[PDB]
Scaffold this active site. Sequence first.
Site, PDB file in Angstrom:
ATOM      1  N   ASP B  42     -75.743   3.572  41.904  1.00 50.04           N
ATOM      2  CA  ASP B  42     -75.349   2.382  42.648  1.00 50.04           C
ATOM      3  C   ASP B  42     -76.137   2.337  43.954  1.00 50.04           C
ATOM      4  O   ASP B  42     -77.108   3.077  44.146  1.00 50.04           O
ATOM      5  CB  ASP B  42     -73.832   2.349  42.875  1.00 50.04           C
ATOM      6  CG  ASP B  42     -73.320   3.580  43.583  1.00 50.04           C
ATOM      7  OD1 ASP B  42     -73.751   4.692  43.225  1.00 50.04           O
ATOM      8  OD2 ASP B  42     -72.484   3.437  44.497  1.00 50.04           O
TER       9      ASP B  42
HETATM   10  P1  LIG Z   1     -73.553  -0.656  46.098  1.00 52.59           P
HETATM   11  O1  LIG Z   1     -74.343  -1.921  45.871  1.00 52.59           O
HETATM   12  O2  LIG Z   1     -72.547  -0.375  45.020  1.00 52.59           O
HETATM   13  O3  LIG Z   1     -72.692  -0.876  47.430  1.00 52.59           O
HETATM   14  C1  LIG Z   1     -71.279  -1.182  47.288  1.00 52.59           C
HETATM   15  C2  LIG Z   1     -70.800  -2.008  48.470  1.00 52.59           C
HETATM   16  C3  LIG Z   1     -70.588  -1.104  49.682  1.00 52.59           C
HETATM   17  C4  LIG Z   1     -71.866  -3.036  48.813  1.00 52.59           C
HETATM   18  C5  LIG Z   1     -69.513  -2.745  48.106  1.00 52.59           C
HETATM   19  O4  LIG Z   1     -69.746  -3.453  46.909  1.00 52.59           O
HETATM   20  C6  LIG Z   1     -68.804  -3.634  49.117  1.00 52.59           C
HETATM   21  O5  LIG Z   1     -69.381  -4.600  49.606  1.00 52.59           O
HETATM   22  N1  LIG Z   1     -67.558  -3.313  49.428  1.00 52.59           N
HETATM   23  C7  LIG Z   1     -66.721  -4.035  50.370  1.00 52.59           C
HETATM   24  C8  LIG Z   1     -67.299  -4.031  51.750  1.00 52.59           C
HETATM   25  C9  LIG Z   1     -67.198  -2.663  52.377  1.00 52.59           C
HETATM   26  O6  LIG Z   1     -67.310  -1.666  51.700  1.00 52.59           O
HETATM   27  N2  LIG Z   1     -66.994  -2.586  53.687  1.00 52.59           N
HETATM   28  C10 LIG Z   1     -66.882  -1.333  54.405  1.00 52.59           C
HETATM   29  C11 LIG Z   1     -68.181  -0.967  55.049  1.00 52.59           C
HETATM   30  S1  LIG Z   1     -68.089   0.110  56.499  1.00 52.59           S
HETATM   31  C12 LIG Z   1     -66.948   1.294  55.929  1.00 52.59           C
HETATM   32  O7  LIG Z   1     -65.796   1.027  55.729  1.00 52.59           O
HETATM   33  C13 LIG Z   1     -67.397   2.689  56.135  1.00 52.59           C
HETATM   34  C14 LIG Z   1     -67.582   2.944  57.571  1.00 52.59           C
HETATM   35  C15 LIG Z   1     -67.136   4.333  57.958  1.00 52.59           C
HETATM   36  C16 LIG Z   1     -68.208   5.194  58.531  1.00 52.59           C
HETATM   37  C17 LIG Z   1     -68.748   4.659  59.812  1.00 52.59           C
HETATM   38  C18 LIG Z   1     -69.836   5.497  60.393  1.00 52.59           C
HETATM   39  C19 LIG Z   1     -69.779   5.634  61.874  1.00 52.59           C
HETATM   40  C20 LIG Z   1     -70.077   7.001  62.371  1.00 52.59           C
HETATM   41  C21 LIG Z   1     -71.510   7.181  62.727  1.00 52.59           C
HETATM   42  C22 LIG Z   1     -71.717   7.980  63.951  1.00 52.59           C
HETATM   43  C23 LIG Z   1     -73.144   8.257  64.217  1.00 52.59           C
HETATM   44  C24 LIG Z   1     -73.397   9.716  64.123  1.00 52.59           C
HETATM   45  C25 LIG Z   1     -72.484  10.335  63.103  1.00 52.59           C
END
Ligand SMILES: *P(=O)(O)OCC(C)(C)[C@H](O)C(=O)NCCC(=O)NCCSC(=O)CCCCCCCCCCCCC
Lengths: 178, 87, 52, 99, 128, 459, 69, 174, 54
Positions: B42
């Site tokens: 994926d």
């Molecule tokens: P592939 O094409 O299968 O992708 C699947 C996706 C993700 C596109 C899904 O089909 C999708 O759109 N799902 C619904 C939308 C979604 O997933 N939204 C959430 C995205 S953000 C999430 O929730 C994760 C964020 C948590 C981590 C954040 C990171 C921040 C920390 C970084 C700090 C920097 C140093 C570590």
Amino acid sequence: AFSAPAAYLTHQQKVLRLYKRALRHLESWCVHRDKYRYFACLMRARFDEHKNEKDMVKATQLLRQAEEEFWYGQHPQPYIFPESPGGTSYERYECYKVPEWCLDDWHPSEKAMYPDYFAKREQWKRLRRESWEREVKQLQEETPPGGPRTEALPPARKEGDLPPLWWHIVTRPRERPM
Amino acid sequence: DAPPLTLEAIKDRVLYVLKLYDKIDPEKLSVNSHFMKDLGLDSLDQVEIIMAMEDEFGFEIPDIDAEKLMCPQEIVDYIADKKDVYE
Amino acid sequence: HVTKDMFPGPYPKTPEERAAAAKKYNMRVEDYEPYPDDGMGYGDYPKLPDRS
Amino acid sequence: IRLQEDPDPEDENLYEKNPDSHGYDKDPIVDLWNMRVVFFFGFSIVLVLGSTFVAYLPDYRMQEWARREAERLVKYREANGLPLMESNCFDPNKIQLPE
Amino acid sequence: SFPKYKPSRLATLPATLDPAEYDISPETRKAQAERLAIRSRLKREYLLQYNDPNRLGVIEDPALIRWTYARSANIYPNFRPTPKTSLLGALFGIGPLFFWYYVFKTDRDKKEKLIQEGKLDQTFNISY
Amino acid sequence: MLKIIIPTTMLLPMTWMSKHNMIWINATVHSLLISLISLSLLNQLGENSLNFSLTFFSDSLSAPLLVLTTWLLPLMLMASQSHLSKETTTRKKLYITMLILLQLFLIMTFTATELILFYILFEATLVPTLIIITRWGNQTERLNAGLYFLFYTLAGSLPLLVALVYIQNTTGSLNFLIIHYWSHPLSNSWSNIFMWLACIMAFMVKMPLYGLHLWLPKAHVEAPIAGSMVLAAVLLKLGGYGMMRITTILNPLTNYMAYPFLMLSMWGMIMTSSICLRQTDLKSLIAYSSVSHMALVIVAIMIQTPWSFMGATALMIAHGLTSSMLFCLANTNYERVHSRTMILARGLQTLLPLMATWWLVASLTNLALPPSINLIGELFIITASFSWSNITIILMGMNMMITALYSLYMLITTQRGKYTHHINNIKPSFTRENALMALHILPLLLLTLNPKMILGPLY
Amino acid sequence: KRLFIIKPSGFYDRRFLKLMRFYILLTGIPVAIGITLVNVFIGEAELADIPEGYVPEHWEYFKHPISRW
Amino acid sequence: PDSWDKDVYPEPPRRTPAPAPQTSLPNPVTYLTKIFDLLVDRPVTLAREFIEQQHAKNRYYYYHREFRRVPDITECEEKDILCMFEAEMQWRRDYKVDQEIVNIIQERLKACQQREGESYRQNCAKELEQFTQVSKAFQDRYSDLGAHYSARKCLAKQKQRMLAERKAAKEAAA
Amino acid sequence: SSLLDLIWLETILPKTTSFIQMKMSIMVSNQKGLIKLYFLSFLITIMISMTLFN
Ligand SMILES: *P(=O)(O)OCC(C)(C)[C@H](O)C(=O)NCCC(=O)NCCSC(=O)CCCCCCCCCCCCC
Ligand SMILES: CCCCCCCCCCCCCCCCCC(=O)OC[C@H](COP(=O)([O-])OCC(O)COP(=O)([O-])OC[C@@H](COC(=O)CCCCCCCCCCCCCCCCC)OC(=O)CCCCCCCCCCCCCCCCC)OC(=O)CCCCCCCCCCCCCCCCC
């Protein structure tokens, strides 16, 4: 760089770019490989947890909160590849790139110093001159009346043609010219 | 300085990385295998594959170009074109 | 090759003038905004975002 | 159109007709001799000859003359106990102050 | 939650933290499409001229010409005497002159007063 | 002085009687010969001037200026032959005639022994310059530039004529030797204030002073290359020479009347350097740098000490050479791409290496880099200003920092970076252009080797 | 494998540098040789007291032979 | 050396201690000095001998110009242009000579500082006082005349100084 | 650059003088060419010269 941008980034593209940026900054924080593997697995676990979400508004809110978290927790000095835009070896060889139009201003003695190269150069120049009309005709035939809606370019539809607007892409200076 | 790259070397290295990926079966992995159509991965898997290739070759592939590399042959062609490898 | 109609002009005061100014600078009418008319000499030149 | 006007001519390149052009004249011989006269006269004649002429210009500013006169005055004044530099430029006896 | 980031003029707001980046109206998408169309038209024109084999010279940029003209020759015709312009010009053009005149005048008056009073160290001051 | 004056009046018929393709060759050769002949004026005395006759005399201040003019003429000929290839024979000869007349007037101006003859000649210099600008300028703005230049100069200089005739009526003579020997103090009165104002304002407009300088960017940017070379190298030095000549009879009123001009010069030096920092036109940047340097020269002349006059003379010579070279470099770039925008042409170091070297040397001389005569003059002026007051050092340091900033900004913008992709008509540098740069730069270094030749009578 | 290096024309810059060096050395070398010979053989004048009743010339008041000439 | 006058440019007698080695180790400085004398000093000495032999065959002389004194600006009448010219030229020559005298004294001071080295503050007190006196006199003579200085202006300055001294003496005697 | 050099140094000395000269030129040259008008002017001038000048 090689791909024409679209009018906007989709939600999938935004979340994938955030995933890559978060992984890179986490790797910058977690210097050692085993620690990076562990925390990258945890990060992908978070992304998988929020993978399946039918509510697009909630998904966008999660993306926004994750972006804020990334900005707060970003490494002030993230790792950058030497050739990358922030890298130390970025644009070091731009002064060494010289074009072929500058190449054809040489003196006859300089050209005589390279007899075989300039014959092939003349062949390339003839190929360029014999295709420009076909390329412009193809471009003006396939464009909509309103104009180019995107920066993409078509390939050659004919057996003897060349892809329009190819000369500078094909004859661009080498990445290590000198 | 460093030895020049070749198409065979690039292909061997990318297949090496892919065969060291656990989610990909090495036996059914060919250079024309699609990452999602016939390998069953994926978007996040493809992002991690691109990051692994970036670590392998020591250069960054921008996100605009990396999303379209859905095949080992596509990755090889991209890397060869960027590094000016013709043999 | 540039004609007299392709050069910066005075501050636009009508929707027609603003539309013509936006068309001249290859911008959208919605995205075109001149500098405020303080008599500082900006004219109809666009006020693009202060980014680098 | 508002006039019967000539088109703007294309820029003329001197290297097209004459690859070994010095950029002076379209004519090859005239251009070569223009280069020769400019280089010879300017560089050789003016630079070298004028520079050595200025270097060997006679000491008409009397710098060395002033130094020798100063040496003589210092020797005489320190031999006789007189001050090396006099207090006044002119003679107070020859100066007549108002009452 | 996490501390907020305050944008400044010399430290702007990142795109990923912009509130409008997550509130996209259907009209925003068509505005983006129109902007991309304008960019594509300009790019196509430039690339045609740039890849023309018979072109020898400089591809004139009307945008560059407009910028250089508005920076130099379009300023006075569009200048009006307003209270803001008058005060700013008076200040920035006259105030520094009087300030430096006062500074140098005071310094030189003090120096000359010391000279007249005969208590300024001027020994070895031969070159002037 | 006739052994130098007559050969110019013979350059005229030689130009008009030579063949169509030999005018440039003959003019260049004989101009170089006349310059070599005029090199003999540098042998000056330590006591007084060289009084050839009742009409002409030479001094340690006039000699370097005359040598600079005679050396500048053939370089102008080279640049003019560069940009006047398609002209007709008659118009080529007319342009050469204008240059020859300008050189003759400048020579007679620098060697004139009376103030009224000096006025006549230094006003006669306007006609050839105005003709050259408004006739062989490339753009529309040449007419406005000529109008501004002419009217600034004349509105400055007419009260000078009135003051000169008044001084002749009052004292009996305008001869410089007589007015120097028979000089009397100027009492603090309104009449003396306005006489001082007339003379000083004429030469300040010629300098130019800050606030009286718009004509300088107007004319210098819009004049042809030879006109730009003569305007910056020599025509700006008429004001400094005149101020160093007239201030004999303006004492002790110069102690009190110099404050506004000193403040204007210092602050406008800072302001014009800052303007140079933000110029989208290369010629305008060079012109404003000239304005700043001449403001420093004005400061030197106004503080009026033996250390300031030597610095003023050295800085005038150095600025003439450096500004001429900068204008020539910018003109070669313009002849390449047919536009004066600085950011249009980039990567010119990777496209033209030796021209990049010439740009580097010219920029290093533009800023005060030791031991160049530019730095010699600037340092002498700064030391004299320090003795004058101890905040002038603050102003001079600010100006030097901004000067280095904008000089290296110009160098990096024009030469470094990556070349413009669509500019594909930048042919290799010509032998003529390279020789022009070499002839601009080598005499400056030789003058650095021998510095007492340009330090003036106060040395 | 050797690859062609695209560079601007250096022929004209080399030619200008060669011509400039030749024309500087065309007269510079003879001038240097003449100065060396003059210094070696016709040395500088020696300072001496003016003989009584003798009126010298200015070139007799100068020291170096070239300056005197 | 007889090139310059030892009285005008004094040098204290040079006291060089004799070598008193305490080790059997050879002296690299001595060995390198012997090599330098063998390889450089002898060839340059032979070359200079040849050059001086060439110079001795063509001996000729140059002289120091003598200027007789002329009446000064005090003796010159008002607006007597010829006398004013002669007096101004003489004043300029005297000004140059005084400048060179100050230069000689400053050279003495610098040489003595360098020579005395670490004990300069005490051993150079004699050359500091001479410089102080010479510079004081020179400053009183030509301190603030200006760019257009002249004998008339210097005479006016001297007259002002004399008037000030006379007034001070009268006030002291009062 | 803009406020001082391009605006106020131009407004004070050169632009204001040119504007005044243009206005005075228009005022002087704006005549309908009427002998009645400028002969009335002649009469006024004659009266002023007779009375105010002695
Ligand atoms: P592939 O094409 O299968 O992708 C699947 C996706 C993700 C596109 C899904 O089909 C999708 O759109 N799902 C619904 C939308 C979604 O997933 N939204 C959430 C995205 S953000 C999430 O929730 C994760 C964020 C948590 C981590 C954040 C990171 C921040 C920390 C970084 C700090 C920097 C140093 C570590
Ligand atoms: C293309 C791009 C570049 C463009 C550049 C720009 C364009 C340039 C255009 C031309 C510009 C010309 C400017 C005017 C020049 C006019 C001439 C002039 O001013 O002459 C000055 C002047 C010439 O002497 P003078 O004042 O006329 O005569 C006074 C004396 O009476 C003389 O003493 P004396 O009579 O006792 O004997 C001296 C005599 C004889 O001397 C000797 O014999 C010395 C012997 C030494 C070795 C002895 C030991 C070894 C013996 C081996 C054998 C032993 C056994 C056999 C012995 C013999 C048989 C018994 O030698 C000479 O007179 C020759 C002096 C040099 C003449 C140079 C002429 C230049 C002409 C101008 C054009 C140049 C164009 C370029 C081409 C140049 C030619 C390639 O002084 C010098 O030339 C000095 C040269 C340097 C000496 C060392 C200085 C100190 C070095 C260290 C300093 C600290 C480190 C700094 C870094 C390193 C240095 C950078």
